[PDB]
């Protein structure tokens, strides 16, 4: 039972599932994420105020 629970359910969340993850909402020194400098992504994030 416990080996099945370990190898089935509690899988590390290597996926962030978009930008609604509170880990990316409040980052730290561990999760470093970035985008290419001076591009549409930069413009979009700069425009959005939240």
């Amino acid at each position: 039972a416990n080996l099945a629970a370990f190898l089935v359910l509690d899988r590390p969340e290597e996926r962030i599932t978009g930008i609604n993850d509170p880990r990316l909402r409040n980052p730290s020194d561990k999760f470093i994420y970035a985008t290419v400098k001076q591009s549409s992504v930069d413009i979009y994030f700069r425009r959005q105020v939240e």
């Binding site: 509170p22 880990r23 409040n26 730290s28």
Partner: protein, 54 residues
């Protein structure tokens, strides 16, 4: 309580984290929010709160 009064929500939360402090008594909204954006959710309140003097 007055024997070891803390000072500041963040300081009291840190003291709880290390183990110097064992329990915190404060508002319900602030503690619900603290538990909401706590990284890893190690601290948990009791029930729905509003235990006394709603």
């Amino acid at each position: 309580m007055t024997r070891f009064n803390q000072r500041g929500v963040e300081d009291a939360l840190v003291s709880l984290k290390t183990g110097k402090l064992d329990a915190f008594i404060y508002d319900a909204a602030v503690l619900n929010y603290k538990a909401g954006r706590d990284e890893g959710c190690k601290l948990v309140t009791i029930g729905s709160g509003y235990i006394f003097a709603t």
